[PDB]
Ligand binder design. Structure first.
Ligand SMILES: O=C([O-])C(=O)[O-]
Ligand SMILES: O=C([O-])C(=O)[O-]
Ligand SMILES: [Zn+2]
Ligand SMILES: [Zn+2]
Lengths: 69, 154
């Protein structure tokens, strides 16, 4: 099941020819979709929201200035 | 869930070092599956200083599948549908450069800022725009200019 110290999945890696490697469950999920190597071929939330909203209309404002020159 | 974990980590990473002219994140951290991205037309490109809002709608199984990306404003561009849906290789689910779990919101946006500067002439979300981009490059530059004006509200 899950590691008793940290409560994470503790699951085996599978390695592939090309070198790269991944969790067994993650790789399988992908194989289900495509038979290739996924890598090659084969703090308050409110403060964050406000920063993001403010950068959006600063981008706009600044765009207007560059356009009007 | 994997999707939500990836998305939270991409947003944090994204925010640390945002590429010039791109602001992207969830519209509300209560739902990381729905983001807005503002992209600015790079300078000295034909969509110069345009500011284009797009919505990214992420699938439950992300990053196994791409988000849908839809520009919310008006656009005239060979790789964008009438409704605003963006159609490029990286956004298509599984000889192009399709979606793999190793892509990211960031790489999607790099790709999209790229297509604004250098269209995929032979791809037909927008036939009219494709043709003109070749035959009447001169008009296309004019239509592009009024598309910028509009995105800016002017
Ligand atoms: O004890 C555990 O490992 C748990 O509850 O996940
Ligand atoms: O449990 C397993 O699958 C292992 O150890 O490889
Ligand atoms: Zn994994
Ligand atoms: Zn590989």
């Amino acid at each position: 099941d899950d590691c008793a110290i940290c409560w994470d999945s503790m699951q085996a890696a599978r390695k592939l020819p090309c070198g790269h490697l991944f969790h067994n469950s993650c790789l399988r999920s992908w194989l289900e979709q495509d038979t290739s190597c996924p890598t090659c071929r084969m703090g308050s939330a409110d403060e964050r929201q406000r920063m993001l909203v403010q950068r959006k209309d600063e981008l706009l404002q600044q765009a207007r200035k560059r356009f009007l020159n | 869930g994997t999707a939500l974990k990836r998305l939270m980590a991409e947003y944090k990473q994204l925010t640390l070092n945002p590429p010039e002219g791109i602001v992207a994140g969830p519209m509300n951290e209560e739902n990381f599956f729905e983001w807005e991205a503002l992209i600015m037309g790079p300078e000295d490109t034909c969509f110069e200083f345009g500011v284009f809002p797009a919505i990214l709608s992420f699938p439950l199984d992300y990053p196994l599948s791409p988000p849908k990306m839809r520009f919310t404003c008006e656009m005239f561009h060979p790789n964008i549908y009438p409704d605003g849906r963006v159609c490029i290789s990286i956004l298509h689910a599984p000889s192009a450069e399709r979606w793999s779990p190793v892509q990211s919101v960031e790489k999607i946006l790099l790709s999209v800022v790229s297509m604004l500067a250098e269209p995929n002439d032979e791809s037909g979300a927008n036939v009219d725009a494709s043709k003109m981009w070749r035959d009447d490059r001169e008009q296309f530059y004019k239509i592009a200019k009024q598309i910028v004006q509009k995105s800016l509200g002017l």
